[PDB]
């Protein structure tokens, strides 16, 4: 009776970074996942624990949507049990994730002659991340044993680095948009399903 809410998570003029990603909660809607095969199921559609076919008719209590922009070769780290700069400091997934990860190419929108310097990721952090958490921090990293007084310099690095994106790059450093859908089941009526 109502159109699916897959119109802002999957269709945005400008996306977000990975260090500060976007979360949307979707519930109490009649959503059809057959449309997911019509916009951009291009690079990857892998998921585990839920069959990608014949299981669209199950009912879950809550649906979560996360969207960000990462590198082309960095989409291999969005999985349970992997390691890397993105997986250990930016976005971590649980060992028994329930949902499908969708990735596709977005070179024509996130590329400029000078480069899109609006996309940033965190390079080093003191400790690894717990699953499903985010950090928006601008504080110097104390790589040495000397207090930094809040000012960068020797052994004092800015913890966020940029993502220069140009159309002339290869298919490895091209910008990609990844939307992670999380299916939750709990002790509550499963209102959202189709």
């Amino acid at each position: 009776t109502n159109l699916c809410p897959f119109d802002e998570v999957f269709n945005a003029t400008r996306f977000a970074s990975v260090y500060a990603w976007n979360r949307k909660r979707i519930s109490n809607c009649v959503a059809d996942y057959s449309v997911l095969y019509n916009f951009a199921p291009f690079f990857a559609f892998k998921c585990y624990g839920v069959s990608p076919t014949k299981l669209n008719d199950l009912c879950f209590t809550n649906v979560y949507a996360d969207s960000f922009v990462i590198r082309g070769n960095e989409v291999s780290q969005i999985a349970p049990g992997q390691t890397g700069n993105i997986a250990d400091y930016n976005y971590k997934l649980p060992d028994d994730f329930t949902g499908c990860v969708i990735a596709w190419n977005s070179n024509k929108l996130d590329s400029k002659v000078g480069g899109n310097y609006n996309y940033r990721y965190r390079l080093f952090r003191k400790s690894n991340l717990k699953p499903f958490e985010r950090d928006i921090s601008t504080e110097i990293y104390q790589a040495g044993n000397k207090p930094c007084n809040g000012v960068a310099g020797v052994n004092c690095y800015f913890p966020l680095q940029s993502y220069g994106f140009r159309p002339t790059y290869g298919v490895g450093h091209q910008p990609y948009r990844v939307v992670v859908l999380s299916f939750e089941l709990l002790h509550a009526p499963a209102t959202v399903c189709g």
Binding site: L123, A143, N155, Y169, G170, V171
Partner: protein, 595 residues
């Protein structure tokens, strides 16, 4: 506290900021080489001014560590390269004019004119003087041509070279080195890796021994050219003596290439060349660059990304744009691979595309490695991988399968002998020239050669090693080591001796693996998978491993072997025994046109 933590973190910051600025510099050069305008060349300056300036601090900010508190082998090498300061560690005031002398020398070489009698009109080296350098057979004009260049420019640079040696020799003593010659020898040095140790002092040992086994080939090659050069000049070449230094097809005598017409064995059977047969089937530039893949795709090497086919220039622009037409393979970084060439429809251009394509494959194999270890194993590895490819693209069997040659084509031994001599004049007649130039330059840098005996020592080794004599001796006015491109702009020359012995070791294993029978000079590695996968072992290591380990995997010997260069010319060596029996071997140094 721990050196490991801060050292590891410093390179993470460097390995990522370098990529942003390195890519900016490379693209700025590509735009200039395709669009030569006043405004476009201006944009280059900033691109190179934010990389040279950026590299200075990171050299200072990585010297504040100490090497012996790092236990990893891979992590330690990245620091050692970044700690080299050059003259920046010395005072700015005693080393300010050292730059001024160096760039002044190159200016004079660029501006050089040799006139003609009566001063009818002026000439220049590119292309006028080089055109008539050895296109004619006039001895008296040859004599004017040689001494004219030696007199005009060699006289001016003599004061500007002793100051070059003396001032910069102390720079080597600033970086903890013995002599400046050993600094140039540090690219072949590896330590702290058991059973894989190579020293600077050792590079003089193998080179001297490796040339000791090349002389038998060079000894007989000299006799053949001397015997047939007597016909053109019958009054000035004795049956037993050294070749004159102005009958060689170059102003300096580097390549003996412009002598095939005067030294062709058989003038009734033409050498195989297909330019008209290709000019039959409406052949275009793209088709040449597409069959280059089929050599690489059918050997299990990867394809090329779609960015190769749109951003690259594979033909003449055809517009009012002004560009440089010299072929070049570019690696802009971050997954961008391009090739620039003014392609035409000729057989010589067919093989050049294979060479330039070999460079790209080497870059495409080690892109995963860090920035500071993204290069060849040593100086002469990049021009050895890309030269064996042209050897399998000019064979008379590969062209037959490609359809550019008739299926019924007999291989006479006259053409085989005729073909081998052409290769010998290029890659065999230049090895003693490079060794003689570097041996003198090492010794002159060491300090064993005194002030008054510079130029006499130059010609003392010329008679014994290569075997050429000067028509008119000079005492202290002509600097013969000043008329070369490399010697006058502070470059090296030993990269041209290793890459010639290295390619034939690679070619002898990629053929034995492919199960080929017969002589090596008709070897095609196409359609072989075992050979094409062995090459992907060295090509992916880059500079992560010592150059000794890279050669160990491909050939099976950790040192330089010269025997493969004697199995590529074995049929040639048999022929010269019969054609030089009624002639004298060797040359006498005492003979000279002194009076």
């Amino acid at each position: 506290s721990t050196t490991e933590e801060q050292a590891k973190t410093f390179l993470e910051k460097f390995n990522h900021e370098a990529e942003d600025l390195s890519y900016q510099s490379s693209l700025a050069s590509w735009n200039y080489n395709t669009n030569i305008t006043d405004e476009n060349v201006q944009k280059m300056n900033e691109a190179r001014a934010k990389w040279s300036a950026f590299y200075e601090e990171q050299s200072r900010m990585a010297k504040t560590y100490s090497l012996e508190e790092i236990q990893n082998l891979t992590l330690k090498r990245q620091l050692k390269a970044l700690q080299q300061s050059g003259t920046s560690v010395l005072s700015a005031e005693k080393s300010k004019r050292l730059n001024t002398i160096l760039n002044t020398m190159s200016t004079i070489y660029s501006t050089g004119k040799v006139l003609d009698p009566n001063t009818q009109e002026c000439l220049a080296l590119e292309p006028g003087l080089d055109d008539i350098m050895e296109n004619s057979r006039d001895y008296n004009r040859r004599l004017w041509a040689w001494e004219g260049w030696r007199a005009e420019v060699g006289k001016q640079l003599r004061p500007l070279y002793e100051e070059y040696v003396v001032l910069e020799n102390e720079m080597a003593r600033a970086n903890n080195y013995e002599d400046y010659g050993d600094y140039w020898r540090g690219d072949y040095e590896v330590t702290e890796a058991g059973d894989y140790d190579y020293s600077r002092d050792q590079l003089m040992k193998d080179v001297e021994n490796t040339f000791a086994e090349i002389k038998p080939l060079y000894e007989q090659l000299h006799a053949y050219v001397r015997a047939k050069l007597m016909d053109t000049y019958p009054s000035y070449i004795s049956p037993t003596g050294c070749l004159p230094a102005h009958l060689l097809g170059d102003m300096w005598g580097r390549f003996w290439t412009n002598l095939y017409s005067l030294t062709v064995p058989f003038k009734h059977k033409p050498s195989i060349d297909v330019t008209e047969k290709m000019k039959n089937q409406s052949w275009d530039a793209e088709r040449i660059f597409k069959e280059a893949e089929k050599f690489f795709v059918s050997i299990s090497l990867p394809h090329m990304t779609q960015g190769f086919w749109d951003n690259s220039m594979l033909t003449e622009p055809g517009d009012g744009r002004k560009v440089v037409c010299h072929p070049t393979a570019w690696d802009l970084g971050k997954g961008d691979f391009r090739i620039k060439m003014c392609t035409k429809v000729t057989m010589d251009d067919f093989l050049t595309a294979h060479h330039e394509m070999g460079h790209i494959q080497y870059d495409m194999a080690y892109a995963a490695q860090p920035y500071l270890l993204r290069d060849g194993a040593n100086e002469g590895f990049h021009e050895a991988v890309g030269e064996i490819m042209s050897l399998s693209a000019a064979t008379p069997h590969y062209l037959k399968a490609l359809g550019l040659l008739e299926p019924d084509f007999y291989e006479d031994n006259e053409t085989e002998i005729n073909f081998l001599l052409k290769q010998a004049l290029t890659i065999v007649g230049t090895l003693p020239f490079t060794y003689m130039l570097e041996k003198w330059r090492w010794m002159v840098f060491k300090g064993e050669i005194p002030k008054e005996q510079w130029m006499e020592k130059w010609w003392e080794m010329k008679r014994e090693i290569v075997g050429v004599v000067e028509p008119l001796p000079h005492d202290e006015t002509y600097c013969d080591p000043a008329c070369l491109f490399h010697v006058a702009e502070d470059y090296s020359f030993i990269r041209y001796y290793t890459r010639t012995i290295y390619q034939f070791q690679f070619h002898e294993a990629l053929c034995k693996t492919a199960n080929h029978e017969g002589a090596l000079f008709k070897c095609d590695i196409s359609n072989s998978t075992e050979a094409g996968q062995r090459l992907l072992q060295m090509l992916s290591l880059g500079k992560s491993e010592p150059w000794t380990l890279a050669l160990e995997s491909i050939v099976g010997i950790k040192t330089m072997d010269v025997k493969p260069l004697l199995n590529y010319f074995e049929p040639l060596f048999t022929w010269l025994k019969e054609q030089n029996r009624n002639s004298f071997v060797g040359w006498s140094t005492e003979w000279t046109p002194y009076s």
